[PDB]
Design a binder for this molecule. Structure first.
Ligand SMILES: *[C@@H]1O[C@H](CO)[C@@H](O[C@@H]2O[C@H](CO)[C@@H](O[C@@H]3O[C@H](CO[C@H]4O[C@H](CO)[C@@H](O)[C@H](O)[C@@H]4O)[C@@H](O)[C@H](O[C@H]4O[C@H](CO)[C@@H](O)[C@H](O)[C@@H]4O[C@H]4O[C@H](CO)[C@@H](O)[C@H](O)[C@@H]4O)[C@@H]3O)[C@H](O)[C@H]2NC(C)=O)[C@H](O)[C@H]1NC(C)=O
Ligand SMILES: *[C@@H]1O[C@H](CO)[C@@H](O[C@@H]2O[C@H](CO)[C@@H](O[C@@H]3O[C@H](CO)[C@@H](O)[C@H](O[C@H]4O[C@H](CO)[C@@H](O)[C@H](O)[C@@H]4O)[C@@H]3O)[C@H](O)[C@H]2NC(C)=O)[C@H](O)[C@H]1NC(C)=O
Ligand SMILES: *[C@@H]1O[C@H](CO)[C@@H](O[C@@H]2O[C@H](CO)[C@@H](O[C@@H]3O[C@H](CO)[C@@H](O)[C@H](O[C@H]4O[C@H](CO)[C@@H](O)[C@H](O)[C@@H]4O)[C@@H]3O)[C@H](O)[C@H]2NC(C)=O)[C@H](O)[C@H]1NC(C)=O
Ligand SMILES: *[C@@H]1O[C@H](CO)[C@@H](O[C@@H]2O[C@H](CO)[C@@H](O[C@@H]3O[C@H](CO)[C@@H](O)[C@H](O)[C@@H]3O)[C@H](O)[C@H]2NC(C)=O)[C@H](O)[C@H]1NC(C)=O
Ligand SMILES: *[C@@H]1O[C@H](CO)[C@@H](O[C@@H]2O[C@H](CO)[C@@H](O)[C@H](O)[C@H]2NC(C)=O)[C@H](O)[C@H]1NC(C)=O
Ligand SMILES: *[C@@H]1O[C@H](CO)[C@@H](O[C@@H]2O[C@H](CO)[C@@H](O)[C@H](O)[C@H]2NC(C)=O)[C@H](O)[C@H]1NC(C)=O
Ligand SMILES: *[C@@H]1O[C@H](CO)[C@@H](O[C@@H]2O[C@H](CO)[C@@H](O)[C@H](O)[C@H]2NC(C)=O)[C@H](O)[C@H]1NC(C)=O
Ligand SMILES: *[C@@H]1O[C@H](CO)[C@@H](O[C@@H]2O[C@H](CO)[C@@H](O)[C@H](O)[C@H]2NC(C)=O)[C@H](O)[C@H]1NC(C)=O
Ligand SMILES: *[C@@H]1O[C@H](CO)[C@@H](O[C@@H]2O[C@H](CO)[C@@H](O)[C@H](O)[C@H]2NC(C)=O)[C@H](O)[C@H]1NC(C)=O
Ligand SMILES: *[C@@H]1O[C@H](CO)[C@@H](O)[C@H](O)[C@H]1NC(C)=O
Ligand SMILES: *[C@@H]1O[C@H](CO)[C@@H](O)[C@H](O)[C@H]1NC(C)=O
Ligand SMILES: *[C@@H]1O[C@H](CO)[C@@H](O)[C@H](O)[C@H]1NC(C)=O
Ligand SMILES: *[C@@H]1O[C@H](CO)[C@@H](O)[C@H](O)[C@H]1NC(C)=O
Ligand SMILES: *[C@@H]1O[C@H](CO)[C@@H](O)[C@H](O)[C@H]1NC(C)=O
Ligand SMILES: *[C@@H]1O[C@H](CO)[C@@H](O)[C@H](O)[C@H]1NC(C)=O
Ligand SMILES: *[C@@H]1O[C@H](CO)[C@@H](O)[C@H](O)[C@H]1NC(C)=O
Lengths: 115, 435, 38
């Protein structure tokens, strides 16, 4: 299942294909397979709203605002690993979640309907 | 000129309040109602993950305490209720034509299969399961309901593997020498844990895991006295125990298809139940402990030991299961030693006096009363020594006593190596794409 | 002791904690929770 989450950065995104196929595969044990299936749903609920519909390591067109800890985004991209940088951007998640639905998904969704 | 992207990254490592299920493997009380156990060779070792545990604050201990009490009560359901016997029992001492001097030969009335017909029989009981009112009441008819256990199940610890739910992960550090908590660098993940045995006792764990190199004292606040100080043992100690009474077990039917067992008679060598401990093995243990308590209290401290204070013998002495019998054994010859000043502090076997009870109250849940069916033959069970409980009581001199009473501390003693993480696979890392 | 005139002082038998021993006590009840068959 999991592996190499510890010491790498970005090269962990090379192996983001085993991380899903093993994922999701009385009454007290039946809380499992409900919240377990509510997860993989409620993110893919909003993942279709992100624009990236399936699994593609993909880019949107919303800007990264540089107010959100602008620290050497070519340099920290490769050396300084995840679980460190995640705490740095742990504060700004909800605000991006408003920008996932307004930039591409209020304007650009109603611009292909012009034709 | 940065343009944020969306990922399915690995770092999900948050707290996991969660449920959990088992992977255990006859209709013995575990009932094999988990899953068939996979060979799970998947301790996937990870590289350099600084993660700190908290063995004192997790829900794995809290669920484990909730599971077994519910599970063991589930085995108690289809058995015979058997409360017509709470009547005016009258007894005497066991007669021996003459001698001097733990048994009571009891005159006794009871119903039969038919509703009206009575039954004047006799049986035997111990000391601590009967009370004076000569009329002798049972020990629990203040407020209880006596319940026989079914004589087919076993009270043996059959080990339980645990597995994570589909979407979480079980984490364990293979690292060494925690002080209870610790930012353990090396770590591996599993979907399924190892087998842990359903044992239950106080003042001494048994049949447990072993240490790495030495004693690992475990607590929260050593400067607090009200803690329960855990002591991990390096090298296990053989404990032989017995109930050397050739005993005859007879059977009767109390009513409409409700069987009942009772101690009929013993063949004739009245003895006392006991346990041997190798003497020179035990002194070799305690030198390791004071070697570490110098490091946590001071170089000029006097380490004393004593027995338990009082309360019930469930709190006072060593609670102990053995082979379908529930012992209670006095352990005064194990903590009669004082180690002095932390500077220059065989072929023998000390033996402890052990008592026998039949009417138990498991986990202090008052009202539930389970009966012990006495069994035929003799009793022998051998166990390692793995875990100890000490209590700092309230000069540099210091006395310790064998504490205990919460069985949660027993399961926390053998589940400190684990933690569970929730999984939220979503990463938003900017690059220069824009399109 | 005497007067004119919703309560009933009731002679009453009952079991005890032990199975055989009986218990002759008394209690009180209202009107609408008891019926003539004294
Ligand atoms: C800590 O860990 C140790 C081991 O890791 C553990 O010790 C083991 O304890 C168990 C239970 O106390 C022991 O199991 C019992 O062993 C006896 C003796 O068996 C030996 O001898 C016979 C004949 O001499 C051989 O056939 C056998 O292979 C052994 O050599 C058995 O008699 C027991 O079996 C009976 O009881 C079971 C439960 O009641 C039944 O499931 C089983 O079918 C047998 O029942 C029959 O006999 C009963 C007699 O009364 C009768 O009532 C039944 O109706 C039926 O007729 C049982 O297997 C085991 O040997 C110990 N092992 C070691 C190495 O010591 C400790 O118990 C543990 N600590 C704690 C607290 O649990
Ligand atoms: C059934 O057997 C039990 C024990 O197997 C027995 O209970 C014991 O009875 C004896 C005698 O009544 C009690 O013995 C006392 O113990 C203390 C300390 O051990 C002694 O100091 C006592 O001696 C003083 O008291 C006597 C009373 O007359 C004096 O005669 C004597 O000179 C001393 O002043 C005394 O020996 C013992 O305490 C109990 N055991 C318990 C747990 O209570 C019981 O009596 C037997 N049944 C019957 C009907 O006899
Ligand atoms: C315990 O107390 C209760 C009440 O506290 C009592 O029950 C009552 O008894 C009286 C007398 O028997 C009943 O009174 C009757 O009521 C009607 C209307 O209220 C009257 O008209 C009746 O008078 C006629 O009947 C009498 C019968 O002899 C004649 O003597 C009289 O001249 C009239 O012809 C009569 O007073 C009353 O009905 C009951 N109450 C109920 C709810 O039934 C009870 O008697 C007491 N216990 C004992 C053992 O005395
Ligand atoms: C608890 O009981 C067990 C067995 O019930 C004891 O184990 C026994 O220990 C003795 C010596 O400690 C062993 O005897 C030796 O055996 C060797 C091997 O043949 C022999 O060469 C020696 O001369 C000596 O006789 C015995 O084999 C061993 N038995 C088993 C089954 O392990 C144990 O010592 C007891 N512990 C206590 C504290 O009483
Ligand atoms: C049940 O009844 C028995 C009657 O002997 C009580 O036993 C004794 O009670 C006193 C007062 O609590 C204690 O000091 C004794 O130690 C008790 N004797 C034993 C052998 O324990 C018992 O307390 C009663 N239980 C309840 C809940 O009322
Ligand atoms: C361990 O527990 C003890 C008492 O339970 C705590 O000791 C207190 O410490 C403060 C400040 O150091 C003192 O003002 C108090 O007087 C102490 N309590 C007593 C009863 O004297 C101690 O702080 C705890 N340790 C930790 C790490 O929390
Ligand atoms: C308890 O006392 C009774 C007294 O009746 C003993 O029962 C008698 O024992 C003798 C020989 O031991 C038999 O011959 C009688 O038939 C028995 N009486 C009945 C009614 O069965 C009994 O042995 C005593 N208990 C013990 C353990 O000795
Ligand atoms: C366990 O054994 C010890 C043996 O010493 C008993 O303790 C003694 O009890 C008497 C009276 O109860 C005291 O006068 C002694 O001072 C005690 N000695 C010690 C070392 O505590 C103890 O009562 C026994 N406990 C049980 C439950 O049997
Ligand atoms: C008590 O612990 C000791 C640890 O040394 C156990 O002894 C070894 O246990 C392993 C696995 O249980 C066996 O593979 C070895 O053969 C054992 N060695 C010896 C010399 O016995 C011992 O089994 C434990 N006690 C019980 C009852 O399981
Ligand atoms: C002694 O008691 C036993 C059983 O309690 C009995 O069989 C025997 O006859 C008795 N002997 C004497 C001399 O009283
Ligand atoms: C048991 O019942 C019989 C009659 O049914 C009675 O004579 C005897 O005294 C009773 N035993 C006790 C100990 O009360
Ligand atoms: C125990 O370990 C924690 C970190 O896990 C540390 O903060 C604390 O000081 C340690 N205490 C002792 C007595 O070593
Ligand atoms: C107990 O005594 C009976 C005889 O009453 C005998 O058959 C049996 O073998 C004895 N028990 C043992 C363990 O030897
Ligand atoms: C245990 O042995 C040491 C020396 O090996 C000795 O000094 C000590 O007194 C012994 N323990 C007791 C309780 O006597
Ligand atoms: C009246 O009744 C009360 C209680 O019913 C009793 O204590 C008292 O003695 C009685 N008085 C007379 C004069 O009968
Ligand atoms: C209650 O029981 C006693 C004897 O047990 C009896 O004499 C009395 O009449 C009973 N009371 C009633 C109201 O029947």
């Amino acid at each position: 299942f999991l592996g190499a989450a510890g010491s790498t950065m970005g090269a962990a995104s090379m192996t983001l294909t085993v991380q899903a196929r093993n994922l999701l595969s009385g009454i007290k044990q039946l809380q499992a397979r409900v919240l377990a299936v509510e997860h993989y749903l409620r993110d893919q609920q909003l993942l279709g709203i992100w624009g990236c519909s399936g699994k593609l390591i993909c880019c949107t067109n919303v800007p990264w605002n540089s107010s959100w800890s602008n620290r050497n985004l070519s340099e920290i991209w490769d050396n300084m690993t995840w679980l460190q940088w995640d705490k740095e951007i742990s504060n700004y998640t909800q605000i991006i979640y408003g920008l996932l639905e307004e930039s591409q998904n209020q304007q650009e969704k109603n611009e292909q309907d012009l034709l | 000129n940065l343009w944020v992207t969306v990922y399915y990254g690995v770092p999900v490592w948050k707290d996991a309040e969660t449920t959990l299920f088992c992977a255990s493997d006859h209709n013995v009380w575990a009932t094999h109602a988990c899953v068939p156990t996979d060979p799970n060779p998947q301790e996937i070792h990870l590289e350099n993950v600084t993660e700190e545990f908290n063995m004192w604050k997790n829900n794995m201990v809290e669920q484990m305490h909730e599971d077994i009490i519910s599970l063991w009560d589930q085995s108690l359901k289809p058995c015979v209720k058997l409360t017509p016997l709470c009547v005016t029992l009258q007894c005497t001492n066991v007669t021996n034509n003459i001698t001097d001097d733990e048994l009571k030969n009891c005159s006794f009335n009871m119903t039969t299969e038919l509703r009206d017909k009575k039954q004047k029989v006799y049986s035997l009981f111990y000391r601590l399961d009967v009370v004076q009112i000569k009329e002798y009441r049972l020990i629990n008819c203040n407020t209880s309901a006596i319940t026989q256990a079914c004589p087919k199940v076993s009270f043996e610890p059959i080990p339980i593997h645990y597995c994570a739910p589909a979407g979480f992960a079980i984490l364990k550090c293979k690292d060494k020498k925690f002080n209870g908590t610790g930012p353990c660098p090396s770590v591996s993940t599993v979907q399924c844990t190892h087998g842990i045995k359903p044992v239950v006792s106080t003042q001494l764990l048994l049949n447990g895991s072993l240490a790495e190199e030495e004693v690992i004292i475990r607590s929260e606040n050593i400067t607090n006295n009200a803690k329960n100080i855990l002591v991990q043992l390096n090298t296990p100690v053989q404990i032989n125990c017995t109930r050397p009474n050739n005993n005859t077990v007879k059977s009767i039917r109390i009513g409409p298809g409700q069987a009942f067992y009772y101690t009929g008679d013993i063949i004739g060598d009245i003895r006392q139940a006991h346990c041997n401990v190798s003497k020179a093995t035990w002194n070799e243990t305690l030198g390791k402990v004071v070697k570490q308590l110098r490091k946590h209290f001071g170089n000029n401290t006097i380490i004393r030991f004593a027995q338990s204070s009082g309360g019930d013998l469930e709190v006072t002495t060593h609670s102990f299961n053995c082979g379908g019998e529930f012992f209670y054994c006095n352990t005064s010859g194990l903590f009669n030693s004082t180690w002095i000043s932390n500077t220059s502090v065989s072929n023998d076997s000390i033996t402890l006096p052990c008592r026998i009870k039949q009417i138990i109250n498991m986990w202090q849940r008052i009202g539930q009363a389970m009966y012990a069916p006495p069994i035929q033959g003799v009793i022998r069970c051998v166990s390692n020594i793995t875990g100890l409980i000490l209590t700092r009581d309230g000069s540099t001199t210091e006395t310790f006593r064998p504490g205990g009473g919460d069985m949660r501390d027993n399961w926390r003693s053998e589940l400190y190596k684990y933690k569970v993480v929730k999984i939220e696979p979503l990463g938003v890392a900017p690059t220069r794409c824009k399109r």
